[PDB]
Structure formats: C-alpha cells, structure tokens
DNA sequence: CGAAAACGGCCACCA
DNA sequence: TGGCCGTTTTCG
C-alpha cells in the first residue's frame, strides 16, 4: 500500500493504494488531482515501512502541469533526496492520444530493467477530447481509450505497480476496469474533500485533506 | 437452493436460487449486481446444509470488476478458506461477444470434470452494446445473445448449476428464458432495495439488503 | 458553359 | 440552430 501522505486519506483507503491495480480519481479542475500525483511520485520511493513502494516513479503528462519543484518539496517533507527523487522519476509529455499510447511501448520495456511502483497519467482524458473533437469519431477515441486502459491493466499485472490516471469532469468503460473511484471536490481555500464513490471493499465515505506547499497532507483546521 | 447470504433475500426467493435455471437481476449501475455475484461465488462452495451447492464457481467477467479480495472477504465471513475459494473459482475476462460465447465452449468441457454450482456472467449485455453499436447490426447481436442464452440453458440442464447474468439498465427475449427477474435499485448509503418483477412461483415483492465489506448481507438499520 | 450564390434540404445534439 | 452539401438559377 503506497501512502498517499494524507493520514485521513490513508485511513479512507485502509492504508493506501493497492499496487497492481488502477485507482481513478475523478473531480473538478483545481481539486488537487495533479498535486496528489506529484506527492505520490515521491512517496512511492519511500520505504515500504513508511508507506512507500521502494520504487521509481513514472509521470506521463498531457497538460503541462509537471513541476519537479513540487517533487522536491515532497521529498524534503518526508526527508528524501530531491535530486534522487528527480533521478527516480522519468517524465514525458504526450502530444496526442496516439503518442500517449505509444509512450506505453517505451514504458513497458523500460519498466523491466528497473523497479517502479507508480505510473502517473495526468489529464488522461483531456487528449481524447482535444484530439477527437468530432461526433462521428467518438467510437475511435473510445476504442483507443479502451486499448489504453487494457494496456494499463496489463502493465499493472506485469510489474505490480500502481496505475494512477486523472480525469477532468467539466467514460463508463473505466468503471469495471478501475478498482477504486474517488470523487474530489473543492472546499474553499486550499482544503479539498475526497469521497469514495465505488469500491467493492472500501465503504462509500469521505475524508478531508489539504494541499500544502510541502505536501498533499491532512487538513489542519 | 444456493443461499444469497442475505436472509431477507433468501426469504424473498424462498431459500435461494434454484440450481439448473437462469436467474436474471436487472438494475441500475452500482446497485450491487457485481457484489451479489462475488458473494454467491463463495457461498456456492458452502455446504448444502448451509445454503450452498458444494460446488466450484465460474466467473466470466466483461467489465473488469472481478475482485478476488471480495471473494476472500465472503469466505472469511462464512468461515471458508479464502485460498480454497480462489482455487474453486475459475476466472476469465471476455473481450467481445464472440469471445464471450467462445468461453462457453471451454466452460462446457471443463464443467464435466469437476462439480460446479454457479456460473457468473457480469455485464453480460455490455459487450452486445460496445461491440454491436450500429443499428443495422442489432439483429446480429440479438441472434448472438439468443444463442448465448440457449447455451446457458443447455449448460444449466446439463450440470444442474445456477446461471447468473448481470444486465445494466441505463432484451425481451430473456423474459421467457429467465425464470426469475429481480429489479435492483439503490437506497442511499450502501443499502439496496430488491424487487421481484416476474416469477410464476415467487410473489411480486420487495426485500431490503445491504452491501457490507464482508458480504452481501441483510440490512441492519 | 460554368462561377457563383441562394436556396433548400439534410443532419447533429439533446432537449 | 449551425454547418454542410445539391441544386438551381443567373449572369457573364
């Protein structure tokens, strides 16, 4: 179980993400999906006794929001070497849906030589909206997304890593494929509300957390 | 009669599913169809005196929602070996309608060597909607579904096992073929309402049940 | 004959 | 209602 670094969120998840499965967090923009991704990108490298996976991180960005400085902040919060964190995070920006899936081909071969624990795909659904904008082409983007999700599940079962994808809510296919769906909504200021909206094992429940300069971290009224 | 593991639902069914016949549960998404399937996948292995069938389980998944951990939770609830439960559940994900029917060919030969009591097909109608999306191809998916249902009835009469298929309600052919139709709807929180909408023997009636971490289990206000 | 435009008709979404 | 395409006519 990879620690989220929010204790309340860890309790909500019973200790953190299950490696080897896809966890989807759907919420409005600015809810902190990207911030949680940046935090996990570092916490994954933490020792297992500290809630990490003792593995490198993979950040596939489609939205430009990748900040190595956020990774440095998370590393210094938990006392990890920021330089080693950036050395254990491989980053690449996907320009389109086809490029987004093509990067998985390099990811599968690269993930064999080194132990990874986390795969991050940020604005995973944005490129299927910007690229495929027509109505007759909807089935094509749905097929590409389906294949992409199957590839995610395959890599998860192959390397035993956690698969994190982010969705902006301004597909029903992900429900059966994703094991845990988390709904994120803004509480005013920088403090966010998290809700579980389906889990066969986890209750439907809510937990409050905040977005702090160092971290994605528990709410401290 | 295979125990549902909800006492109120067992009373609704007069003790549980009749083996050798198809029981259809149609309801909205998140009503708990999959949860009931996971529970039954373990309860089938229970002794007959405990409401089981003393047989192995078969889970054909089309939606990715298969969770061995849910099976482990159901096994520990009723005190069954979780490892033996997973050893008595054969699992396979159908990628399309043709693959969904093709898996029945392996199922028929495999079900001869060992005693099974339950066959689960989850999102059974989803692949006929994702694969066959056009309007001119509707008769083709209806024919494939008809043949699939006939194969289900044949296997039910051959092995005396319970046939469970799940349908998302966002065909009229199943009515004559399915013996008991159950309508599932959400009560808020995790507690679900079950209604019988046709049975020649069972009354039209309703029963309240809940979805608990261990189990599909009676409502406990 | 044919550019071009002016109309007409047809479709998309979901209401 | 907006867009696109078939057409029709109109003017050179």
Numbering used by the authors:
A (entry chain K), B (entry chain L): 101 to 270, 289 to 339
What does the literature reporting this entry say, word for word?
At the other DNA end of the nucleosome, the eight-base-pair dsDNA plus a three-base 3′ ssDNA overhang, designed to mimic the dsDNA–ssDNA junction created at a DSB terminus, protruded as the linker DNA of the nucleosome. In this central hole, we observed the electron microscopy density of the dsDNA–ssDNA junction region at the DSB site. Notably, this junction region is located close to a RAD51 L1 loop and may directly interact with it. The RAD51 L1 and L2 loops are known as the active DNA-binding sites for the homologous-pairing reaction. Therefore, the RAD51 ring might first assemble on the linker DNA as an active ring form, and then subsequently recognize the dsDNA–ssDNA junction by the L1 loop, when the ssDNA region that has been processed by enzymatic resection from a DSB end reaches the central hole of the RAD51 rings.
RAD51 is the central eukaryotic recombinase required for meiotic recombination and mitotic repair of double-strand DNA breaks (DSBs). We found that RAD51 forms multiple conformations in the complex with the nucleosome, such as ring forms with eight (octameric), nine (nonameric) or ten (decameric) protomers, and a filament form.
